[PDB]
Amino acid sequence: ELNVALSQVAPKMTTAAGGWAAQAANSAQQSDVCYSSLLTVTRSAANFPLANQPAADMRVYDTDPATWNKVALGLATAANLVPEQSMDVPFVVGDARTSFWERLQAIPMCIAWTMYYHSRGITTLAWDNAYTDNTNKWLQKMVRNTFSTTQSVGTIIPARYGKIVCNLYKNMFHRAPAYVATSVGGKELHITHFERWLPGGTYANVYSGAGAVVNCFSPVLIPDIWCQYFTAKLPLFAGAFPPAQGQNSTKGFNSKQGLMIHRNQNNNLVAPYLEKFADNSSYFPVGQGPEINDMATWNGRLWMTTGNVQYLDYSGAAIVEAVPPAGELPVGKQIPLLAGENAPIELTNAATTCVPRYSNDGRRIFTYLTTAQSVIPVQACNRAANLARSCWLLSNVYAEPALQALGDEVEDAFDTLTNS
């Protein structure tokens, strides 16, 4: 499981309006490429054989001769070394389908890291520059904990907040990832590849259509549908947009759910129903960051999908970070098509969830629309309108007719005849 964590490696993103963008033919940004941990793979600067050896990425254990020699001779038996049968070998060993399986085992890792990095929107320059230049006591705490920094004596200490990622894999896929046993202070604890990473490194940012760095989102690496179709129980802020032309289609969360609107209407520029501030209005406190709110992160990506989105400020001024040219969310990599087989249409292969909320400056980022073009999302938040978003028609999702000419309730034809 911890080669799939660091050998299944994925190209980053590309900002575009519709679906299916890619980079170029020969470019440094096409083969720019990331882990499943939303964490850019170190590219070699020298020539092989490498003179300067870079920083390490994941902690592993070793095998020494001094214990292997006593184990191989019957002078030594441990608790994790009780022999077994040949039919108890993992069935991956020796099969022709390993490369297809390891390709699929990497996707629910990146969903757990994707929901980790999107809950607090800690925009990719804040993750990258958290060791380069930081004056905030919070942003340095977030990187120190998430990655396995601590060492006592010769023992991989599991990271804080990577047990949050491990619990976003168990509570979300109903499957636990494989571990080893590890004694830190005489206490028996388990450690996963979610907990073994090392601090440092560029994270997964987004490139534009022309190839420029667009590091103003949270780290994205895979689009929305892989998070939403593969998940048993998925959180609120990253939910699929339901079909367009239906009753109860696509609405938001207003002040009935405790949120507040910002409305900098002097610069024709209003923001969603976001959470209450409590000294988070313009600058965050030294040592505090964005609150986990799913009502407001759903509501913020509900405005990023409108089409002309500004990521400015409390007062409406520009941030230091690189903004995409339009309402141009990061969209998935385009591969060649086959016979009778289409491309995605409109924000269907996109990555919507990456709502920026925390700037590099320790400053709050607001998602803005114009006062004129936000009357319909505000009424959608007030539950007085529906919104029209594109969706995948998969397994319970039906195409809604334009004239909703509803009848009675119940409507169970062959359904009570089955288990309903």
Binding site: V9, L50, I107, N167, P223, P242, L394, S395
Partner: protein, 105 residues
């Protein structure tokens, strides 16, 4: 899950309630059971090939914002373990003008 209506969005668990500690058995999540979520999929334009060479993508119908159904639309499966050292550039193979990605434990 994919939302069929907005009442499935509202009835979704929070981030805090989906990140507590759990104490269940919870079998490992093998790609032998992730292969069927991408193969046994809903669609009528899907040709349903039986070989792994064609069962890579996420195929499916898509329903637009204006109410139009796109028949067999695909999302790339975005995880490889292969750096191309010879890129198809200008319809023919040139070698790559890019360095190689290295990791270290």
């Amino acid at each position: 899950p994919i939302s069929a209506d907005f009442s499935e969005v509202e009835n979704a668990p929070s981030f805090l309630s989906l990140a507590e500690n759990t104490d269940e058995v919870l079998k490992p999540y093998t790609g032998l059971e992730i292969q069927t979520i991408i193969t046994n999929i809903v669609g009528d334009a899907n040709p349903n090939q039986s070989r792994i060479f064609d069962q890579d993508r996420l195929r499916g119908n898509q329903y637009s914002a204006g109410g139009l159904v796109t028949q067999n639309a695909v999302s790339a499966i975005p995880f490889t373990n292969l750096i191309p050292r010879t890129i198809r550039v200008g319809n023919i193979l040139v070698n790559s003008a890019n360095r190689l990605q290295i990791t270290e434990t």
